[PDB]
Structures are given as C-alpha cells and as structure tokens.
Design a protein around this ligand. Structure first.
Ligand code: NAG
Ligand code: NAG
Ligand code: NAG
Ligand code: NAG
Ligand code: NAG
Ligand code: NAG
Ligand code: NAG
Lengths: 50, 172, 88, 198, 50
C-alpha cells in the first residue's frame, strides 16, 4: 500500500498474521511496520476553508 | 491530489461554486431554524428559591443543579437514549446544548411563575393555583372545581409525570 | 475556538449579543482602541420573578405599538427556449 | 435594508440567469466554445462529436437550472400560502393566536402593497407599568365562600376590591360581582371580609 | 479516463446535493411547525382542537 498521511504510534493490537487494518469505509487506517513489529496509525493532515 | 485532473475539471464551468452556495444556504438555514424555534424570549428568567407551588411537584422538569449540565432528568434520559476523509467537513452548530437547556429552563420558569403574560409584555407574578383556576375558567369549568380539588389535581399531575418518566426510561 | 483557529481577534471574559456569528457559541464584534474581539454570546439579561403565595401584579396603563412584517408572494415569470439555447 | 427578504429572491434569480449565461460559454471538452468554428475547420464526424459534447453539457446545465427553479418555487409557494393565511386572519377579523398577527394582544392590521410581496402593519396592545398587590382565592362572609365572577380580589393593604385582569379598576365588592359556591372549609387561603348587599 | 471519472463523480455529487436540498426543505417545514406549536401553545392557551 501507498499514500500520504500523518504517521502516529497507535495502540490497537493486531493478529500475528495480519499486516494492515481498515475501517468501515474501507480506508487505510493502521499499518504494521515491516522491520519492527509495531502498529502505526495513518491520519490525513489538516484541511479546511478560510 | 491531482493537477491534470483539476486542469481538466476547469473546462466544465462553475458547478462547484453552485453546489457550495447551496450547501452554505442549507447550513445557514439549519441554524436559522433553531434560532427561530428556541430563541423566542428576551430575558432569561431564573427559578425562585424553595417553592410552594400549591402542591404540584415540578422536580422532574426544572434544571438539575447537581451535575454541571443544566439539563433536567428527562433531558438526561432523552440525551442518553438517542445514540475528515475526502474533503467532508462537519460544521459545528451555533448554539450549544447548554444554551438550548438555558432557553428551555427560562421558558419553563416564565410559564410557571408568570403564566401567559410574559409573551406579550412584562412578566407579572401570580400564584400557580390562581393560574390553574384561570386555565380551568378558560376550558369551560368554573374556579370552584379547582379550588375544591387542587389536591387531587396535584396528585394526578405527579402520577402522570411519574408515568411519563417511566415510559421514557423503559422504551424509546 | 471549538470551530477552528481564529487568527486576528482577541479574547475577552465578557458576554454581549451576537453580532458576527462564528460557531460553537463564540461570537465576534467590532468594539473599542478599536479592534476585533471574540466573546461568548449572552442569551439574555437575568430577570428573576418575585413569586410568592399571595402576590399579583396588575398593569395600570397601556401603549399602542404598530409593527411591520414582510412576506414574499411571487417571482419573475421566465421561459427559456431549449433549442435556441443549446443550438445557436 | 429592512426589505431584504424581497430582494433575496431577485438576487437569486439574477445569479441563476448569470450562471446560465456563463455556462453557455464553456467547452465541457472540445476544440472551441462556439459551435460554428467547430464545424468550420474540422471533418464532419469529429465536428459532430464536439457538438454532441456541448449538447450534453448544455442539457445538464439546463436541467440543473430547472431543478433549482422548481426547488425555489416550492418555497415561494409555501411563503405565498403563509402570506395568504396571514392576510385572511389579520384584517378580516381579530385573531387570538399568540404571536401570530403581531407581538402582543392583536387589535387590527392594514395591508400595504410591495414589489413581489406584501407588507402588514400589525396594531397590537402592549401592557404598561405594573403595580404590586395582594390577592386571595375567595372571601368568607357568613361561612360561605365567595369567588370572583370576572376579576381578581385585590387588596391595597387595608381594604379589598375587585378589578379586571388587564386593567386596574377597583370596584366595591358586592353580591353583583361574586357568586356563592360551597363553604369556607376547603378553600386553601380563604380570607375574611364583608360582602356588601345593595 | 479522467474525464469519465470526473463526469461520474460530478453526477454523484449533484445527486447528493439535490437530496440534501430536499431533506433541508423538509427539516425547515418541520422546524416552522415546531416554532408555531411553541409560540401558540407554550406562551398561551390555544383553542385549536387536537
Ligand atoms: C531488522 O533490522 C533492524 C536494523 O535496523 C533491527 O533493529 C530489527 O530488530 C530487525 N528485525 C528483525 C525481525 O530481525
Ligand atoms: C418531588 O419528587 C421527587 C422525586 O424523587 C421527590 O424527591 C420530592 O420529595 C418530591 N417533592 C414533593 C414536594 O413532593
Ligand atoms: C398613561 O401614560 C400616558 C403617557 O404619559 C399618560 O398621559 C396617561 O395619563 C397615563 N394614564 C394613566 C391612567 O395614568
Ligand atoms: C409587592 O407588593 C407589596 C405591597 O403589597 C410591596 O411592598 C412590595 O415591594 C411588592 N414587591 C414587588 C417585588 O414588587
Ligand atoms: C386603600 O384604598 C382605600 C380606598 O377606600 C383607602 O381608604 C386606603 O387608605 C388605602 N390604603 C392604603 C394603604 O393606601
Ligand atoms: C402559602 O399559600 C397558602 C395558600 O394561600 C397560604 O395559606 C399560606 O399562608 C402561604 N404560606 C406562606 C409561607 O406564604
Ligand atoms: C375568619 O372567621 C372565622 C370565624 O369568625 C375564624 O375561625 C377564622 O380564623 C377567620 N379567619 C381569619 C383569616 O381571620
């Protein structure tokens, strides 16, 4: 997977075989780092109107 | 996140501006609706001290001062029963829940203490028993019917309030 | 604020009427020197009623007051030719 | 700047017309905006395709315009029905609906013509400066409870009177302003006084 | 391909805007009814049956 977003260290536990999770809207939310077995979070940066 | 897509979309015309104006009109009407429904009183009337309202127990609709929220028990039940991805933004409302609660409390205090005179001129205090007697005189019956049955009327009112609370807490 | 970031206005611990609405209860106005302020809107002036077991307030005078209410009725009647519009 | 509700309709109509006119000068994907220059320097099939593109674009624009006009006409018809009801029950009679035909007690209204609208002049009745008194449910004279016929039992500190609920006109409490019903044992707050018999 | 995607997404957005306009009109009618019921019943005594 690819994309652009703010990476943050989350705390949701994953299964030993799963790699990346999604949401109800089918969007990339959390991805496990390939090297270290840590669960990260993917959140888009701020956006709005002026 | 595409520049060529935007350059292609610029050839279609002014549809984005139209839909944005439509959504802005919807958003401003959503606040005008509540600002017209709830904000109908000028002065915020406060509840008096310990009250002998003839025998009626208005302890389930007045604002509960225990919790910081100015919502009553029925309002708490009603709030507890009802339960940033691709450019979608949820604009916050203009009036918070606390302002709506204060408006409802002011309206309730005005209807209890003054009656029906706080919607035309200045608030005029009057005993609640005489207010109910005037209501009964408006529905057809005389004042003696209430002056001789105020106890039964207050008991039935308390029972009805309790039944309403039970029905709201049981099913929604 | 609770509706974003307000850059250019100063906060104040007062409560006036809402002149320029912002959101989440926060309102702005132009008052005195002169600058742009941001305050929490006030719903109204506190007016406690002197209720008791035996007390009634009866007015003694009256004031006639004429008001004004405007309501739209109709619009402009238009008609566009589809063929002449699409095809020149 | 008080007649803004009437000006908003004209502003929206003008904005819609200007948007339509500006959409008449778009491409939606083509070689040019004007249609004759498309067929001038181009082969028949590609010119027809580019004309079909503009046809689809203008059809979509006109459909959106008609939809917006219908949505606006619905609200305008609702407002016109409200204005007709408020014209019926304001002038051809005295209404008792609170805060409907004017703020306060309604007396009369006068209609006035306006461009694409109507202006009402609600003549209301607003109370004035108050005056505190002391009230009582009934009055006991000879073991019988006397209730006020139409008014309140008002006392100025020393004596008792009876006046209407909308104006202070103290009258002498007599048997022509009260009716006897029951005895002085049930009314909570029964006061003692003397009812005058003419 | 981008033109086809743009047309599809614009049609979807227009349908969404139309549905939102209809729902907003319904909500405005309901709010007007609620305001009438609040002004003619709470701040007085109505003689309208039911
Ligand atoms: C992968 O290599 C990194 C070196 O930066 C090391 O820290 C990590 O523990 C290694 N992971 C495994 C599973 O060997
Ligand atoms: C009113 O009802 C509440 C319900 O718990 C009760 O605590 C309170 O004592 C009642 N007050 C009167 C005056 O009956
Ligand atoms: C009511 O107010 C007007 C205005 O000052 C005054 O002229 C009139 O005398 C007042 N009425 C009474 C009964 O005092
Ligand atoms: C109520 O009326 C009494 C006189 O009967 C007066 O002394 C008192 O000030 C009045 N209270 C208010 C709040 O107007
Ligand atoms: C009350 O009104 C009566 C009128 O008969 C008057 O004689 C009396 O002095 C008044 N009392 C006071 C306290 O003003
Ligand atoms: C409360 O109202 C009742 C009814 O008129 C009256 O009998 C009683 O004296 C009043 N008590 C107080 C403390 O005002
Ligand atoms: C009214 O008179 C009766 C009998 O004379 C007496 O029992 C009662 O206490 C009196 N009420 C007052 C308020 O003085």
């Amino acid at each position: 997977l690819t994309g652009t977003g703010v990476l943050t260290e989350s705390n949701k536990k994953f299964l030993p075989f799963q790699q990346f999770g999604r949401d109800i809207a089918d969007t990339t939310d959390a991805v496990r780092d390939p090297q270290t077995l840590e669960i990260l979070d993917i959140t888009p940066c701020s956006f709005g109107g002026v | 996140d595409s520049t060529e897509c935007s350059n292609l979309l610029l050839q279609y015309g002014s549809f984005c501006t139209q839909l944005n104006r439509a959504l802005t009109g919807i958003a401003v009407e959503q606040d005008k609706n509540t600002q017209e429904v709830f904000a109908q009183v000028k002065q915020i009337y406060k509840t008096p001290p310990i009250k002998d309202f003839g025998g009626f127990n208005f302890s389930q609709i007045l604002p509960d001062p225990s919790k910081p929220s100015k919502r009553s028990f029925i309002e708490d039940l009603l709030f507890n029963k009802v339960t940033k991805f691709n450019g979608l933004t949820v604009l916050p409302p203009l009036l918070t829940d606390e302002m709506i609660a204060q408006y409802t409390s002011a309206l309730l205090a005005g209807t209890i203490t003054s009656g029906w005179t706080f919607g035309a001129g200045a608030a005029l205090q009057i005993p609640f028993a005489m207010q109910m007697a005037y209501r009964f005189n408006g529905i057809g019956v005389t004042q003696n019917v209430l002056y001789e049955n105020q106890k039964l009327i207050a008991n039935q009112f308390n029972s009805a309030i309790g039944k309403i609370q039970d029905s709201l807490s049981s099913t929604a | 604020t609770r509706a974003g970031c307000l850059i250019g206005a100063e906060h104040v611990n007062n409560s006036y009427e809402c002149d320029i609405p912002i959101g989440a209860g926060i309102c702005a106005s132009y008052q005195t020197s002169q600058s742009i302020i941001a305050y929490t809107m006030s719903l109204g002036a506190e007016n406690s009623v002197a209720y008791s077991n035996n007390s009634i307030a009866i007015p003694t005078n009256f004031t006639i007051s004429v008001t004004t209410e405007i309501l739209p009725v109709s619009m402009t009647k238009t008609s566009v030719d589809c063929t002449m519009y699409i095809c020149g | 700047s008080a007649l803004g509700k009437l000006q908003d309709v004209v502003n929206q109509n003008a904005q819609a017309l200007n948007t339509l006119v500006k959409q008449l000068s778009s491409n939606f994907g083509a070689i040019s905006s004007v249609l004759n220059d498309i067929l001038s320097r181009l082969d028949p099939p590609e010119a027809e395709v580019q004309i079909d593109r503009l046809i689809t674009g203008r059809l979509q624009s006109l459909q959106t315009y008609v939809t917006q006009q219908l949505i606006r006409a619905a609200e305008i018809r609702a407002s016109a029905n409200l204005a007709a009801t408020k014209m019926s029950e304001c002038v051809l009679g005295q209404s008792k609906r609170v805060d409907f035909c004017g703020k306060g007690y309604h007396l009369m209204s006068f209609p006035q013509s306006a461009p694409h609208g109507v202006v009402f002049l609600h003549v209301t009745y607003v109370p004035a400066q108050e005056k505190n008194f002391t009230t009582a449910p009934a009055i006991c004279h000879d073991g019988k409870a006397h209730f006020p016929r139409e008014g309140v039992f008002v006392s100025n500190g020393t004596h008792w009177f009876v006046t209407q609920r909308n104006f202070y006109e103290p009258q002498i409490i007599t048997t022509d302003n009260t009716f006897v019903s029951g005895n002085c044992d049930v009314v909570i707050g029964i006061v003692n006084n003397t009812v005058y018999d003419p």
